[PDB]
Design a protein around this ligand. Structure first.
Ligand SMILES: Fc1cc(-c2cccc3ncc(-c4cnn(C5CCNCC5)c4)nc23)cc(F)c1CN1CCOCC1
Length: 293
């Protein structure tokens, strides 16, 4: 009767899709007729469903349910367990998988024009997210999905935070998961996240795309090279902070057009106020696409 309420006993496990950030995503068929004709869906669940994790996950579900945009993965519904009230998030299944894996596999057939189409789409998803005063915090190609050859979507919201009514940043007091090699300097030093730190991370995504996910050129590999591979644990963060303060940055990807490299470097401004807006990034990227087309 209500198609957003899924009964977990009808979800048949097909394959695991990924594991991380204290969660897992599976491919399942929702098959109440038990004849293998039901709809294939993506299901996100918790590995460790403590009360603290369940509270955070229900906010994540509300965030995703509130978003309706061509470049954001579609919410379909939820599962509730009897008693302890474990939760599963049901989403559309996007069959080409993560943009990270897709580009790693098809780098030979994906030209700059196509990379800029994806870039534009990522910018548009993020601009829309910003209109709801949500801060993604975890923008990376591993969290972006490919629906088909012409459309990508932002595909996970596990670190996403809602800005306070009175402030333009959110401070995380006791972080767990921290993708530090995608983090703005002020996020490393003060745990402060904003639309502007999302723009910094978007610059790292653009780097990822134009390196075609070459492992030796990944942001972790390059930053560890620049600070020294001898640095370990909390010393990595200390030295990364000092590097960024001195305008140490990821290099230009081999063969990257100047106009795109310039955008990357503008996103990586130490001065938070000088970073471009997602509205202006989408305009600029679409102008470049037009110039190339
Ligand atoms: F960020 C993610 C998002 C998803 C995800 C979210 C929502 C819908 C999805 N639809 C399809 C696929 C997907 C992924 N790979 N494939 C391939 C399967 C074999 N055929 C080729 C395509 C399909 N992944 C989907 C899965 C993940 F895993 C991560 C990454 N993290 C996982 C842990 O939680 C945090 C995010």
């Amino acid at each position: 009767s209500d198609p957003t309420q899924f009964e977990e006993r009808h979800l048949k496990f097909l394959q695991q899709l990924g594991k991380g950030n204290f969660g897992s995503v599976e491919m399942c068929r929702y098959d109440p007729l038990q004849d293998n004709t039901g709809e294939v869906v993506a299901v996100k669940k918790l590995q460790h469903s403590t009360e603290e994790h369940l509270r955070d996950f229900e906010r994540e579900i509300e965030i995703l349910k509130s978003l309706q945009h061509d470049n954001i993965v579609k919410y379909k519904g939820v599962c509730y367990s009897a008693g302890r009230r474990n939760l599963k998030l049901i989403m559309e299944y996007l069959p080409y998988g993560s943009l990270r894996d897709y580009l790693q596999k098809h780098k030979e057939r994906i030209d700059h024009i196509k990379l800029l189409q994806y870039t534009s789409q990522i910018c548009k998803g993020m601009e829309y997210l910003g209109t709801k005063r949500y801060i993604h915090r975890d923008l990376a190609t591993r969290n972006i999905l490919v629906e088909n050859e012409n459309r990508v979507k932002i595909g996970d919201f596990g670190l996403t935070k809602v800005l306070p009514q009175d402030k333009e940043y959110y401070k995380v007091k006791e972080p767990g998961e921290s993708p530090i090699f995608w983090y703005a300097p002020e996020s490393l030093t003060e745990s402060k996240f904003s639309v502007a730190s999302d723009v910094w991370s978007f610059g790292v995504v653009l780097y990822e795309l134009f390196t075609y996910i070459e492992k030796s050129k990944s942001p972790p590999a390059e930053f560890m090279r620049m600070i020294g591979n001898d640095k370990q644990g909390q010393m990595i963060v200390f030295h990364l902070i000092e590097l960024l303060k001195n305008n140490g940055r990821l290099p230009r990807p081999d063969g990257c057009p100047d106009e795109i490299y310039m955008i990357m470097t503008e996103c990586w401004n130490n001065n938070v106020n000088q970073r471009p807006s997602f509205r202006d990034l989408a305009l600029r990227v679409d102008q470049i696409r037009d110039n190339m087309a």
